[PDB]
């Protein structure tokens, strides 16, 4: 398969035509996406197959071919970029200062950017280019605008 690092689309043929159900991140030979994108199902990459290795419905994350690799975190201070991959449109960087989700379990960065559902799994970047989390699990606010958590997993 295409094991090369970088951002990828997640496509299905099970709906009308070719539908993009979301996005993921390939890093150190491991594919990272949100759980709700695949629901833990196997993926094709050319001839190559990708089998799920790790996931958790509550963190809404899944990894393929190996353990979660992304360990960078938001410093709580600096702007970041959503590397957004909308359906049928080119990868496009958007820069923003994250807001905050305050929870009984501590605080998480949040990005207030509206995109189609099929953008779920687009990576969020720090200034050194490191992935600090995936976009597309969050909430809808007073405006009717979307706010995503910066969702990040753990590395062993």
């Amino acid at each position: 398969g295409e094991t090369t690092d970088g951002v990828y689309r997640v496509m299905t043929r099970r709906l009308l035509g070719s539908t993009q159900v979301g996005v993921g991140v390939m890093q150190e030979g491991v594919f990272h996406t949100m759980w709700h994108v695949t629901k833990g199902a196997a993926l094709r990459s050319g001839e190559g197959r990708l089998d799920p290795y790790w996931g958790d419905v509550k963190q809404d994350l899944v990894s393929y071919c190996g353990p979660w690799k992304l360990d960078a975190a938001w410093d709580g201070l600096s702007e970041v970029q959503l590397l957004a991959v909308p359906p049928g449109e080119r990868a496009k960087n958007i820069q923003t200062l994250p807001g905050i989700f305050k929870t009984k379990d501590g605080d998480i960065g949040a990005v207030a950017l509206d995109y189609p559902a099929g953008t779920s799994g687009s990576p969020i970047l720090d200034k050194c280019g490191r992935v600090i989390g995936l976009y597309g699990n969050g909430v809808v606010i007073k405006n009717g605008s979307y706010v995503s958590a910066i969702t990040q997993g753990k590395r062993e």
Partner: protein, 39 residues
């Protein structure tokens, strides 16, 4: 059945488009992995 297609390199782009605000929101996370607005 689902498949993957490469979309780009993961890089910071100088003079990316800058937008979005920074709300501070109280949220709950349920066992299904769904956030909801606490108020």
């Amino acid at each position: 059945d689902m498949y993957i297609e490469r979309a780009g390199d993961i890089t910071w782009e100088k003079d990316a488009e800058v937008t979005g605000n920074s709300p501070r929101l109280d949220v709950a996370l349920d066992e299904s992995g769904d956030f909801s607005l606490v108020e």
